[PDB]
Structure formats: C-alpha cells, structure tokens
Amino acid sequence: SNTQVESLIAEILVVLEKHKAPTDLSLMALGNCVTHLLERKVPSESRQAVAEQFAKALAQSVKSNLE
Amino acid sequence: SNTQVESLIAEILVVLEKHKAPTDLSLMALGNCVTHLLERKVPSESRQAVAEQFAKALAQSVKSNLE
Numbered sequence: 001s002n003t004q005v006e007s008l009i010a011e012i013l014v015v016l017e018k019h020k021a022p023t024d025l026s027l028m029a030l031g032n033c034v035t036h037l038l039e040r041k042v043p044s045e046s047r048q049a050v051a052e053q054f055a056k057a058l059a060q061s062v063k064s065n066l067e
Numbered sequence: 068s069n070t071q072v073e074s075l076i077a078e079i080l081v082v083l084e085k086h087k088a089p090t091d092l093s094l095m096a097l098g099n100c101v102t103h104l105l106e107r108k109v110p111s112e113s114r115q116a117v118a119e120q121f122a123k124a125l126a127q128s129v130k131s132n133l134e
Binding site for chain 1: 071072075076078079080082083086088090092093094095096097098099100101102103104105106108109111114115117118119121122124125126128129130132133
C-alpha cells in the first residue's frame with residue numbers, strides 16, 4: 001500500500017514539476033484538489049470535519065518532519 | 068492564471084481518477100504532496116505557519132462551498 005501511496009504522490013509531484021509551478025501555485029492547486037474531492041465524495045455534513053482532520057494531519061506531519 | 072491553476076488541478080485530479088483511488092487515499096497522497104513541497108521549498112522556520120495557512124484556506128474554502 002505504501003508503494004501505492006508513494007506512486008500516486010510521485011505522479012502528482014511530477015505534474016507540479018512539469019509545470020515548474022511555484023510553491024504558492026502548487027499549494028493552491030493541491031488545496032483545490034482536496035476541496036474538489038470533499039465536495040464530490042464527502043457528505044456535506046462531514047465535509048468541514050474531514051477538512052479539519054486533513055488539516056490536523058498536515059500540521060502534525062509538518063511538525064514531526066521538523067525532527 | 069485561472070486557466071493555469073485549473074489546468075494543474077485537472078491534471079492532478081485525472082491522476083487520482085486514473086487510479087480510481089479512494090477518497091482517503093487521495094487525501095493522503097494530496098497531503099503528502101503538500102508536506103513534500105513545504106519540506107523542500109519552505110524554510111523550516113515558516114513551514115508550520117505555511118501549513119497552517121494552507122489549512123485555514125482549505126477550511127474556509129470548504130465552509131464557503133457550503134453555501
């Protein structure tokens with residue numbers, strides 16, 4: 001499964017690299033992708049909650065990476 | 068610029084769609100992409116802060132989308 005996640009990640013990263021897209025642009029696109037998914041696959045009532053858990057995970061991820 | 072953002076977004080979304088990747092898997096990959104970018108292009112001292120602003124934007128985005 002790790003190889004599955006990693007492959008998805010690599011594929012998405014290459015997309016950003018191919019466009020030589022700036023950091024801010026990359027984040028904006030990535031954020032919109034999350035927003036798109038939540039709106040299209042998460043019930044309106046849980047959307048904010050899933051968004052917040054995504055955010056917490058991101059924050060924790062970044063923090064720990066600061067090790 | 069909107070077409071530029073939208074094109075990036077579409078390209079990333081197609082990547083997820085091609086894998087028929089589940090929502091949770093998509094989020095995990097997307098989150099890792101943000102983490103990757105922050106670690107590779109944002110100074111260690113601002114990383115958490117940029118991560119939090121990304122999160123706020125995401126949260127606000129989702130909220131407003133609930134209109």
